[PDB]
Amino acid sequence: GWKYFKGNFYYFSLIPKTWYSAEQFCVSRNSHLTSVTSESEQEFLYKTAGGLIYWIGLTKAGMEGDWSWVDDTPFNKVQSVRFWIPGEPNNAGNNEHCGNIKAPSLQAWNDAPCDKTFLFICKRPYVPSEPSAWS
Numbered sequence: 141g142w143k144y145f146k147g148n149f150y151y152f153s154l155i156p157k158t159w160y161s162a163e164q165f166c167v168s169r170n171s172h173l174t175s176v177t178s179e180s181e182q183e184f185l186y187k188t189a190g191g192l193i194y195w196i197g198l199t200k201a202g203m204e205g206d207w208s209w210v211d212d213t214p215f216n217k218v219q220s221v222r223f224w225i226p227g228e229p230n231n232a233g234n235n236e237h238c239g240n241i242k243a244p245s246l247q248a249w250n251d252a253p254c255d256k257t258f259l260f261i262c263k264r265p266y267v268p269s270e271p272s273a274w275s
């Protein structure tokens with residue numbers, strides 16, 4: 141049930157998991173919880189989500205607590221401000237270290253406790269099968 145958009149395939153889950161058990165599910169399928177890198181991707185994701193909440197690849201990294209992507213895409217703080225619900229991330233209860241798509245809007249993301257169970261979205265690039273490019 142992977143959906144295709146601009147060079148990547150996406151899996152919207154049918155069963156909810158904690159953030160980390162969602163990521164392990166993605167990894168078992170050669171993917172990761174999704175990063176979000178453009179307005180058009182954010183639009184594809186929140187529209188497809190259809191008002192349900194889904195874990196995405198947002199999680200804290202470093203001692204400063206900077207947001208990061210689990211698929212190792214460098215996190216662009218400046219260009220991601222436009223993507224959080226107003227007021228977020230708010231670290232409610234000093235315990236919200238993972239992020240989801242919550243609101244069906246370009247301003248969609250919420251920080252939530254990593255141990256909460258939600259549906260989730262994996263991403264993986266299309267990688268053609270081709271003979272070795274070394275030679």
Ligand SMILES: OC[C@H]1O[C@H](O)[C@@H](O)[C@@H](O)[C@@H]1O
Nearest residue numbers: 228230232236250251252253
């Ligand atoms: O009011 C927003 C607030 O709602 C609940 O408390 C949780 O979803 C928080 O993560 C969120 O920031």
Ligand SMILES: [Ca+2]
Nearest residue numbers: 230231250251
């Ligand atoms: Ca929050």
